[PDB]
Amino acid sequence: NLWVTVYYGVPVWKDAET
Amino acid sequence: RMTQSPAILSLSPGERATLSCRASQSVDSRLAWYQQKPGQSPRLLIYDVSSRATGIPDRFSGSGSGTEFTLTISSLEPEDVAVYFCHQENDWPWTFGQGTKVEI
């Protein structure tokens, strides 16, 4: 009996070109 | 105020047991269930409406919404002789219903 919780500032990344 | 209707339930081993609870007000999906074997302090079986407590056999399950809730005990193995209680955790006066007894 779980629900979605939204987090902002999560320490993740993905490869990118900038 | 919480009411548990099957005050006395007596069932042969292998027969699935159904227990129930009706709240006077919505439980807002925060009902828990407890098992009290004679001579023992109560233990938590189910901690959220369908969420099973740690160390508890898969035989224990439940459901409900609003004010209507149930507890299901699959198999009803001989060890499960106890008083079963409903507990409402979504308000301050965390009422326990009057537990009912299940006898093998």
Place this chain on the structure above:
Amino acid sequence: RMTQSPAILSLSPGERATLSCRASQSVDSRLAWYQQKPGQSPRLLIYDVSSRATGIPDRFSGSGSGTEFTLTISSLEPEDVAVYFCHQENDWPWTFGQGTKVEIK
């Protein structure tokens, strides 16, 4: 709780009628008036203190603020002999006052 002071009104045809209601607590402009025609279920006249309901004649009006409210009829036509109720819609206990009666003289 709220009460209505003019328990009995008696007016000539065409005369202007004033009814009133006094709340113990603010209704924050959520108040309605109902007319219970004899033998009928009550019907809505005015809501949110002064908003006229669909189907209600322009002779019906009203006002008020906070706790002091009024219902008025600019011309009392012979038809409007009824009990007039005050209804509170600003809390859960949707209290009705004890409606007063308007008699035609």
Place this chain on the structure above:
Amino acid sequence: RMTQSPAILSLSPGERATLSCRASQSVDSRLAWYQQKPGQSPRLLIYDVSSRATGIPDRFSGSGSGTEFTLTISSLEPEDVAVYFCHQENDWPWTFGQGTKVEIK
């Protein structure tokens, strides 16, 4: 409400007094202390647990948290004999406790 513990105090001139008040519920630091000299209306001494009111001597101070608070003075002067009251203000029904008396020997 709240309980004032030292119902009667009696001090040698020059000694400091300590008074205490136990709230029934946390006051969330909205406690005020008042001084009522005989025949006078109460005067504000301290507010928000420890803030001193304008015109009040620095002899007066106070402290505490939750439900457990005190009122203290550095020394008792003859002019400081009064009944001292504990006033809660973190809920509408502002509540006063039963003030105690600080007598001088």
Place this chain on the structure above:
Amino acid sequence: VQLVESGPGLVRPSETLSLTCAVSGDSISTNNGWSWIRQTPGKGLEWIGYINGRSGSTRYNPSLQSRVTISTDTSGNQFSLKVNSVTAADTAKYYCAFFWSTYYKRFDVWGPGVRVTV
């Protein structure tokens, strides 16, 4: 919408009330504000409570709440009022009503009502 009240008006002091209202013109399952109100000489109008026909939840007048329940059966467009500890004080005319109150609109629908003597 049209509302029609029903149920027996002859009640013993030892039994429950059971009043079922028929709804016609819309569905219970699509609306809210389905409610019961009663009228008695000692009290012009007393709200009892209402039910949300979409979710099934209810709200009751706190003074009556301890002994009252409201429920629906949307398959027949009907809903009902049940009171357990029914006494002489509960003699009243009972009404079925639909209360619509939203940001953009306000209206009531009332049935004719029934009388119950305890």
Place this chain on the structure above:
Amino acid sequence: VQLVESGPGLVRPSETLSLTCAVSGDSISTNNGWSWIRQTPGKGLEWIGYINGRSGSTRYNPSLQSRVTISTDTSGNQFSLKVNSVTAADTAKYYCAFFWSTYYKRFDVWGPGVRVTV
């Protein structure tokens, strides 16, 4: 600001208790916190209630609500307290007070007080 209470020094149970407080130094119509406090030998200090002079709204100690009202008067720059049911138990010195509480400041003004026998 200065506050002065006045009214009957004795009120019988069937009579309405009425105390009027004169206000000097500012206008009622501008401030809030105009209030009454009761003092009796069996109760150190009891809060009665207050009125907002800008909006006219009031808040009463719920225990007195069934019989209490507070109102203002622009003309005499005064305000008053009334008790709709008098009982011997409510014998007290009534005080008129002004409570200023804001984010940036705090103070009280208290009047002399009037003893009323019931």
Place this chain on the structure above:
Amino acid sequence: VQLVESGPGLVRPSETLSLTCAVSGDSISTNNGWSWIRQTPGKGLEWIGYINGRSGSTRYNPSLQSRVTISTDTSGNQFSLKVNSVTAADTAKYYCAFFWSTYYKRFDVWGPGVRVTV
């Protein structure tokens, strides 16, 4: 965590009931949810209340607030319950319990309990 209840089994109406609970396996000061609950042969299990071991704040069952205090002793790594008015209805089995409920977890720890008779 392990919880052990202790105190006099027999108390009189004029006496304060005092029960303590020793806590082993963790620190009182780092946990919320330390609580007292009870069972009566004629009553379902009910709450007395709880205290935050870290903050000192409490919650109590409204029916028991006037005579009940819960407090801790973090140097003793234990906590206690005091009931300052004792009646026949207070005969019950009392328990020490720890209630952990957070967004990510839920569990209880219960002591064996003590029998208290008035």
Place this chain on the structure above:
Amino acid sequence: GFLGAAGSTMGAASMTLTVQARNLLSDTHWGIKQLQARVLAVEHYLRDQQLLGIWGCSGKLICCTNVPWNSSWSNRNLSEIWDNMTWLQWDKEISNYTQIIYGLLEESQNQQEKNEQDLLELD
């Protein structure tokens, strides 16, 4: 410091959300390239803020919603996810459902707004 919690469990890492949040804002040819880069950082920031607003979350680093968790997105325990897994692992674990979940979050808020259009309490 920034990304210090990257190898920590989700539970532990949820306590450092603020430090990550604070690091999002901090020759013609060269000048255009730099303006390009600055504008994009702003646009990305605003898109995340708009989504949170749409979902009913505003001014919060942690926000709860009414969307049930689907066992088909991830069938794991709470202790498993919060204590024995990092956010990087989790992000990979459910990357397949990112848009599904986002669509549901929006629908939930829209229903909430519809319910708030009633003056009736809806109890």
Place this chain on the structure above:
Amino acid sequence: GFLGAAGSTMGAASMTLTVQARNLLSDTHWGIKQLQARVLAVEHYLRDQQLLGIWGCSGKLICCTNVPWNSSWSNRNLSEIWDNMTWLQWDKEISNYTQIIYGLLEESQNQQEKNEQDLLELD
């Protein structure tokens, strides 16, 4: 889809406000023109958000305030506006009062903040 509600009545159109919001944030001379266009999109977005902030409606798609409606701005039945009129038609009908209403919304919020300085619990 986007603007599919353009011909809908105001009541019905208001059911889908998110779709209209989520679509707002999507050679030297060419490069400069494009940067100018991106910047304006951001500046306009932020201007509208600031007004919602000032009026006390931050984070909401539908917000109730205390400014009363003036019969001189428009005098129609509430049902006439919500059921027999579209948003385009309405916008034209009251375009004359847009600035008046905005001014009043700001004044109302300022009064509300002053009332919150009260500490007598605002009654």
Place this chain on the structure above:
Amino acid sequence: GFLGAAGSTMGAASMTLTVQARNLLSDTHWGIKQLQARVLAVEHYLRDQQLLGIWGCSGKLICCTNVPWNSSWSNRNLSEIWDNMTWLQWDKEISNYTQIIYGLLEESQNQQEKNEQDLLELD
């Protein structure tokens, strides 16, 4: 008008905060310089809004917090600060503690979130 309150006392000046907020938003070399200036104005605006978000003051002009005032930052009477000083004077008096105070506000909000995660509805 804008900055008309600059010589007013802090108390009186705080009565008109909206006017100070509404005035924050609005050849190759010339074009780049202007884009430079506009992008930067946006970045500053957002930076301040992010801090209000972090401190738990999003969408407000006046916000109460849980950080105690330190006598070491400034030891003055409450009535002294609010009635006998302007905001410019105040800013100079505590300019050395700006970052200290901001750091504490951030810690406070983080603790508040940790308390919310508790579910016993107690601090």
